[PDB]
Amino acid sequence: MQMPRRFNTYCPHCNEHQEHEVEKVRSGRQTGMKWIDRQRERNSGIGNDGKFSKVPGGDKPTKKTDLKYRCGECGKAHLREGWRAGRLEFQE
Amino acid sequence: GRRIQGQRRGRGTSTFRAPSHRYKADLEHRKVEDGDVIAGTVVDIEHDPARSAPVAAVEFEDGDRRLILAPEGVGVGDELQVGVSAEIAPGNTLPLAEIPEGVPVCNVESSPGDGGKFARASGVNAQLLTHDRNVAVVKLPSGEMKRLDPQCRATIGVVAGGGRTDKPFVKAGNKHHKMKARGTKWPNVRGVAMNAVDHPFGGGGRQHPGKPKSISRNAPPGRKVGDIASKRTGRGG
Amino acid sequence: ARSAYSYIRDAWENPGDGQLAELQWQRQQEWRNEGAVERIERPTRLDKARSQGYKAKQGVIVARVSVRKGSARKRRHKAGRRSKRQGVTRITRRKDIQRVAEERASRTFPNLRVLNSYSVGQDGRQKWHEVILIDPNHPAIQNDDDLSWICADDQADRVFRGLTGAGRRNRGLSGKGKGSEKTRPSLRSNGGKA
Amino acid sequence: TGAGTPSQGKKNTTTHTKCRRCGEKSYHTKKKVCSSCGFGKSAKRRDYEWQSKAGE
RNA sequence: GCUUUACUGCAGGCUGUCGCUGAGGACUCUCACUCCGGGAGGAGGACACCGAUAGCCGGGCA
RNA sequence: ACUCGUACGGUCACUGAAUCCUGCCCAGUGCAGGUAUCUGAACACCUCGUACAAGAGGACGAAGGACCUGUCAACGGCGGG
RNA sequence: AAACAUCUCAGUAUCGGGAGGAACAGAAAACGCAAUGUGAUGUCGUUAGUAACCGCGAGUGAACGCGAUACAGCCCAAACC
Ligand SMILES: [Cl-]
Ligand SMILES: [Cl-]
Ligand SMILES: [Cl-]
Ligand SMILES: [Cl-]
Ligand SMILES: [K+]
Ligand SMILES: [Mg+2]
Ligand SMILES: [Mg+2]
Ligand SMILES: [Mg+2]
Ligand SMILES: [Mg+2]
Ligand SMILES: [Mg+2]
Ligand SMILES: [Mg+2]
Ligand SMILES: [Mg+2]
Ligand SMILES: [Mg+2]
Ligand SMILES: [Mg+2]
Ligand SMILES: [Mg+2]
Ligand SMILES: [Mg+2]
Ligand SMILES: [Mg+2]
Ligand SMILES: [Mg+2]
Ligand SMILES: [Mg+2]
Ligand SMILES: [Mg+2]
Ligand SMILES: [Mg+2]
Ligand SMILES: [Mg+2]
Ligand code: NA
Ligand code: NA
Ligand code: NA
Ligand code: NA
Ligand code: NA
Ligand code: NA
Ligand code: NA
Ligand code: NA
Ligand SMILES: [Sr+2]
Ligand SMILES: [Sr+2]
Ligand SMILES: [Sr+2]
Ligand SMILES: [Sr+2]
Ligand SMILES: [Sr+2]
Ligand SMILES: [Sr+2]
Ligand SMILES: [Sr+2]
Ligand SMILES: [Sr+2]
Ligand SMILES: [Sr+2]
Ligand SMILES: [Sr+2]
Ligand SMILES: [Sr+2]
Ligand SMILES: [Sr+2]
Ligand SMILES: [Sr+2]
Ligand SMILES: [Sr+2]
Ligand SMILES: [Sr+2]
Ligand SMILES: [Sr+2]
Numbered sequence: 001m002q003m004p005r006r007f008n009t010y011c012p013h014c015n016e017h018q019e020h021e022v023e024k025v026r027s028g029r030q031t032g033m034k035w036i037d038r039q040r041e042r043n044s045g046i047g048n049d050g051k052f053s054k055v056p057g058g059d060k061p062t063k064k065t066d067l068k069y070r071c072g073e074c075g076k077a078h079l080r081e082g083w084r085a086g087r088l089e090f091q092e
Numbered sequence: 093g094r095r096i097q098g099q100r101r102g103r104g105t106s107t108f109r110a111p112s113h114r115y116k117a118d119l120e121h122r123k124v125e126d127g128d129v130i131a132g133t134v135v136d137i138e139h140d141p142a143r144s145a146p147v148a149a150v151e152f153e154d155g156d157r158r159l160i161l162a163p164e165g166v167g168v169g170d171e172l173q174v175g176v177s178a179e180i181a182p183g184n185t186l187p188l189a190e191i192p193e194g195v196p197v198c199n200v201e202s203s204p205g206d207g208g209k210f211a212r213a214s215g216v217n218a219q220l221l222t223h224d225r226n227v228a229v230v231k232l233p234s235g236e237m238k239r240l241d242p243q244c245r246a247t248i249g250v251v252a253g254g255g256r257t258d259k260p261f262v263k264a265g266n267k268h269h270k271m272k273a274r275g276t277k278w279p280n281v282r283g284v285a286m287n288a289v290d291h292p293f294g295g296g297g298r299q300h301p302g303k304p305k306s307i308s309r310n311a312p313p314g315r316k317v318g319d320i321a322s323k324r325t326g327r328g329g
Numbered sequence: 330a331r332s333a334y335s336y337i338r339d340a341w342e343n344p345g346d347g348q349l350a351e352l353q354w355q356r357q358q359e360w361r362n363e364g365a366v367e368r369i370e371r372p373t374r375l376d377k378a379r380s381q382g383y384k385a386k387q388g389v390i391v392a393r394v395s396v397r398k399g400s401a402r403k404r405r406h407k408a409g410r411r412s413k414r415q416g417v418t419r420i421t422r423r424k425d426i427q428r429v430a431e432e433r434a435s436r437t438f439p440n441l442r443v444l445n446s447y448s449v450g451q452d453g454r455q456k457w458h459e460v461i462l463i464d465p466n467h468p469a470i471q472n473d474d475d476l477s478w479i480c481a482d483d484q485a486d487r488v489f490r491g492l493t494g495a496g497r498r499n500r501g502l503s504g505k506g507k508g509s510e511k512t513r514p515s516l517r518s519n520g521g522k523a
Numbered sequence: 524t525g526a527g528t529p530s531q532g533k534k535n536t537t538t539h540t541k542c543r544r545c546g547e548k549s550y551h552t553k554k555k556v557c558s559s560c561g562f563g564k565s566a567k568r569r570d571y572e573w574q575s576k577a578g579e
Numbered sequence: 580g581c582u583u584u585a586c587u588g589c590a591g592g593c594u595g596u597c598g599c600u601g602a603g604g605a606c607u608c609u610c611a612c613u614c615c616g617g618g619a620g621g622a623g624g625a626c627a628c629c630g631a632u633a634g635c636c637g638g639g640c641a
Numbered sequence: 642a643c644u645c646g647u648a649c650g651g652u653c654a655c656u657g658a659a660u661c662c663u664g665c666c667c668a669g670u671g672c673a674g675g676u677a678u679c680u681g682a683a684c685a686c687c688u689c690g691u692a693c694a695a696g697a698g699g700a701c702g703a704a705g706g707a708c709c710u711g712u713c714a715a716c717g718g719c720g721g722g
Numbered sequence: 723a724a725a726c727a728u729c730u731c732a733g734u735a736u737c738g739g740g741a742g743g744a745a746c747a748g749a750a751a752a753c754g755c756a757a758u759g760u761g762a763u764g765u766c767g768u769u770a771g772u773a774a775c776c777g778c779g780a781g782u783g784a785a786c787g788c789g790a791u792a793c794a795g796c797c798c799a800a801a802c803c
Contacts, residue, residue: 032696043728043776046419047412048587050728051777093581093639098653104642118645123617142645159645199647203615203622214649234648241615241622257649262658275643276651283654288581292639293654295581302582304716305654306672310592314639318654323673324712332800354601354611361612380799398599399630405590406641412588412727415641432739453599453612454629475798482742489740505752505762510784514747514764521733577735584670587727594704596684633683635705 005090011071012078019072093289110275115142119161120207121245128175145214145253161199163249182249188228189242197246204243215254334376366437368392373449381445388467394430395455427458427495434460435488443488
């Protein structure tokens, strides 16, 4: 479906309606320094490694929208529930 | 499953050992200080149980009685020489360096003084081709050009008993007797005729390997069976 | 002023440099030709020996022992095991090589008791340690104020029970506080979890 | 030839005999090892914790 | 119990790297080390063996 | 162990005396060889990051794979129109 | 663990070696109720199923301290001779 790149809506920060710019959430890079990362190293040894021997799951036929809503004046973004959309193209 | 026959062999149990207590002697060249002043006289021709070929008992000048790897054409009474200055005739041993190129040789040493390693079986022979001050090129029975230290000793002539392979065993019983004189378990049951538990090819309603026979060089023992790291198979091409 | 001993010590802080380097390169050639346990008239590291209790006296013996380098020489499981207990290659023993050396030396001299030991280097495939052993039955020792303690019955076969300095360390007994909850007073009394 | 009764007739070999060390008829005269006390195998006396219940 | 391109692992083989290991992306040398030789000495040589680790193969085995 | 053995050897497999014979197929799988380029781990090296370290990235790149070739008395195949 | 691989059963069963009448531990490179504080080590009660671990599942699981028992502190290496 089509999605307007910018539009007026509520900004929970300014606490008033303002223009927002919508962007798809880009995955942030990992650091490899979180607790889970250290547990993987500590608990993996000779033989099967329990949960650390499991491999990536599957995929849903369609994913939900994953967007950021940036306020045009205070510059802060907020998140919203997403809705299943086969494709999401922006207009302008 | 269970270990395959090839794995049982390695343990060196009686069934797989050679009847060593019945073997006669290790036909290694004599060790000469130097000079070649060593000569001996063929005192008798005997049967070597471990090679199905004849061997010659020799009495040397200094009183040493030893069996020797005999070439074809050696008989009782004949005198043999072993040294750097030995004469160039059938039955004599000397370093390759002293041998004239183009002369059939046998019981060639791998490393000078080791006693002989190559061309020792019935009717075979290595062919000394090239000389030099650093390397002596010899053509082994398999056709391979071997580079050897000119200081490697060897016996002139071809090994006695040639043609042994020209006659067929004809019957199982004849194979039987020869096998009883070797370190070999015989007869041979085919892999495809065994149960799955006993061999990679075992099992199945009808006999057939349930897999390609060309096995990788990296395969572990127990699995390395069939055609080992074959560069090709068949007769075609 | 500095003791002459301090010079042997300082040399051994960097066994791979200076004259000591050349000595080892020379020595190991001979060591490699000696047996598993060789009694030697004098410690190779005098400073270390005296420091550990050695004395030039009757009843005091020193022996060099060599042991193969690396992990456990273990046989793969011949019966059922869960993946966890199928390892072979990366398994290491719980006793360090110095401890193994101490025991071999002590077995060679059944009447002697291990006093202490120290390292004298290694090559690519083995390690050498020198072990100080004491004769608890010799009067020159029964009368020594610094060593007579090792004559007590309860010191018999001390090495085999981990009572050696290398033994106590290997048992995780170095620390008196944090970390020694499962080591003191013994690995066994703590259910073998240390 | 059955593995039972008929094969029992061939048994006239002497193996286990009275042991010099422990007195039991367990000294295997072919191996020269006592299966009961370990004589011929070890200076120490043959013993095992499984010869009794674990907690006893 | 048996099978395999089932799951997960484990031996084993190949291969790189570090230690053993020295002198002057290709090279010479000798002194460790290896092999041959009764010995003298010869061959090889910082490789190989061995210890450690990494990638690949891996129903041979669990 | 084989082996007091050395290619006229002995190891690993298939077929199963003699006689007359043994066609076509290398795409898949297996084995083997080659390989400009591609891909390909760790240690060392370089950049960022940290007064250090974790970590992120880069350069190099072995076997292996991609790719090419050989091979069926190698696994096997030899149909429908 | 209602399968099962990490985990659990369990450092249990069993095996190798070794001492004693009891063993082992033990005079801080401790503790960290953070203090102007405690003062070798076992052990018992408690701290506590607490902190911590863990397909963060099933399960596993201390310590400092405190109240007790009993109390005990010393010897070398080196410097200088
Ligand atoms: Cl989206
Ligand atoms: Cl034959
Ligand atoms: Cl002792
Ligand atoms: Cl306190
Ligand atoms: K289990
Ligand atoms: Mg011979
Ligand atoms: Mg036989
Ligand atoms: Mg057959
Ligand atoms: Mg059958
Ligand atoms: Mg099988
Ligand atoms: Mg058939
Ligand atoms: Mg068939
Ligand atoms: Mg004093
Ligand atoms: Mg206790
Ligand atoms: Mg040798
Ligand atoms: Mg299985
Ligand atoms: Mg048949
Ligand atoms: Mg269960
Ligand atoms: Mg565990
Ligand atoms: Mg569950
Ligand atoms: Mg537990
Ligand atoms: Mg604490
Ligand atoms: Na851990
Ligand atoms: Na002893
Ligand atoms: Na069954
Ligand atoms: Na094909
Ligand atoms: Na259950
Ligand atoms: Na089950
Ligand atoms: Na777990
Ligand atoms: Na208090
Ligand atoms: Sr761990
Ligand atoms: Sr693992
Ligand atoms: Sr799906
Ligand atoms: Sr020989
Ligand atoms: Sr010889
Ligand atoms: Sr089959
Ligand atoms: Sr053909
Ligand atoms: Sr004893
Ligand atoms: Sr029968
Ligand atoms: Sr009958
Ligand atoms: Sr009988
Ligand atoms: Sr015995
Ligand atoms: Sr016992
Ligand atoms: Sr035929
Ligand atoms: Sr092919
Ligand atoms: Sr006190």
